[PDB]
Amino acid sequence: NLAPLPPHVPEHLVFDFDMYNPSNLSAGVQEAWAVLQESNVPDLVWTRCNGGHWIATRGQLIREAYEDYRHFSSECPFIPREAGEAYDFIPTSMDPPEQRQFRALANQVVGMPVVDKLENRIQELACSLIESLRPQGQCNFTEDYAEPFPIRIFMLLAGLPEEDIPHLKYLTDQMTRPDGSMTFAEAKEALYDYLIPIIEQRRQKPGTDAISIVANGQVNGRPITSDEAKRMCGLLLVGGLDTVVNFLSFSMEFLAKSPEHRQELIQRPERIPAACEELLRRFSLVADGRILTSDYEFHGVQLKKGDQILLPQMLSGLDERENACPMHVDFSRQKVSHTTFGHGSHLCLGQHLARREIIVTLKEWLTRIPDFSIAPGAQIQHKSGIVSGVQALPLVWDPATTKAV
Ligand code: HEM
Numbered sequence: 001n002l003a004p005l006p007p008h009v010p011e012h013l014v015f016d017f018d019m020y021n022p023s024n025l026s027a028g029v030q031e032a033w034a035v036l037q038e039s040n041v042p043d044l045v046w047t048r049c050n051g052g053h054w055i056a057t058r059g060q061l062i063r064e065a066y067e068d069y070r071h072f073s074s075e076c077p078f079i080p081r082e083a084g085e086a087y088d089f090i091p092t093s094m095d096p097p098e099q100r101q102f103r104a105l106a107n108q109v110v111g112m113p114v115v116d117k118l119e120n121r122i123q124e125l126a127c128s129l130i131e132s133l134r135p136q137g138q139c140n141f142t143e144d145y146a147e148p149f150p151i152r153i154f155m156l157l158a159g160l161p162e163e164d165i166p167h168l169k170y171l172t173d174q175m176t177r178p179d180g181s182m183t184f185a186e187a188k189e190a191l192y193d194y195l196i197p198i199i200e201q202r203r204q205k206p207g208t209d210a211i212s213i214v215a216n217g218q219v220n221g222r223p224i225t226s227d228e229a230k231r232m233c234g235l236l237l238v239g240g241l242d243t244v245v246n247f248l249s250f251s252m253e254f255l256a257k258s259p260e261h262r263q264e265l266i267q268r269p270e271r272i273p274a275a276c277e278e279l280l281r282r283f284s285l286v287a288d289g290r291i292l293t294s295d296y297e298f299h300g301v302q303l304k305k306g307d308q309i310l311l312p313q314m315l316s317g318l319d320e321r322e323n324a325c326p327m328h329v330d331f332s333r334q335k336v337s338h339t340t341f342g343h344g345s346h347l348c349l350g351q352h353l354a355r356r357e358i359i360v361t362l363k364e365w366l367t368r369i370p371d372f373s374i375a376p377g378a379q380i381q382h383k384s385g386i387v388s389g390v391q392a393l394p395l396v397w398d399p400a401t402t403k404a405v
């Protein structure tokens, strides 16, 4: 149920939003979150759900809060409170100045030059998976492409066996969209139980994979400890297994429902980079936040030391103060404004690898299967959380319209 109102929270600012189960969920998850941006609702509200916390609802306030690490700390970034307390991943659980040194090391394994290195295998794998599904006339897109494609690339990058994917994917999902069988703390500890033996193994026998580079790496001179390497590798696992996976499915659900947008990109495959950005704005999917270090008056509201505030990256680009007609997808938008990959000092390091997996998917899929639909009568359901997603996505096409390349 609800959590009792704190003394400092005025009554006219209460709007009971549940981020794990929004009441408008059937209309789509972005639409369900967009109810916070209607005429009746203020820029900053308090919900009594999930222990009780603030939510900033506007792009202006979300950008402002992510720039100010002094008042708004990363130490406790997840809601509910006990998930945020247990959270100790690197570099996401630290503020500047100390987080900055770990960023350069993580950038060695997921940054731009490693993307260039992988580009040939990313190409190879997409074409292979799509050419396999092509004669079939149908697929559950989430199972058949959206999961195997990003995840297999990450397991290659990190040098882990493919047979381990089911176990790891399950644990990751409990951290982002819990079903109640595991607490955040139990999920995290089980991921660490997996990593520790492997990090010890590649510290005595180094390879060229991602885990070997992190474990044998250096932060601003000094050798990195086994503990820090475990906490950095934990984040990379979560990021590689539950981000692009979920976004690909939102993008393809839209494309199956809009043959005009599908056609524009077939006619002009050079607009596909630009299309990628608009889809990232419209189908943004991440929402975490920050904790108040002191009492602070933020835009005429009293925040108290210890309060959690959810600062949904998702909402910035759906805000009509930033983009006009925000629920409409337009590939020739003049300025595409979002904070899909974050804002401030914690800007997503894997964003280059993300965009390449997205752009290669669009180009290579439309090139082979230009005409497809949602399976008729099937109702598409979303799920909300720290990272939102899609439960299933049955597609159908007719194999005579396809092209073997
Ligand atoms: C659709 C794809 C993706 C989205 C929307 C996304 C979103 C984000 C967001 C919002 C943050 C900031 C978190 C915060 O401020 O608390 C972030 C950080 C981060 N992401 Fe991503 N991400 C994506 C893909 C990836 C991938 C594929 C990886 C690579 C394994 C990854 C690795 C990281 C890392 C290492 C950080 C931590 C950076 C730091 O704290 O300094 N992300 N991402």
Ligand SMILES: CC1(C)[C@H]2CC[C@]1(C)C(=O)C2
Binding pocket: 089, 092, 176, 238, 239, 243, 286, 288, 386, 387
């Ligand atoms: C997307 C992410 C990698 C980023 C925000 C949520 C996430 C799952 C993390 O724990 C950090």
Ligand SMILES: [K+]
Binding pocket: 075, 076, 077, 084, 085, 086, 087, 088, 093
């Ligand atoms: K913490």
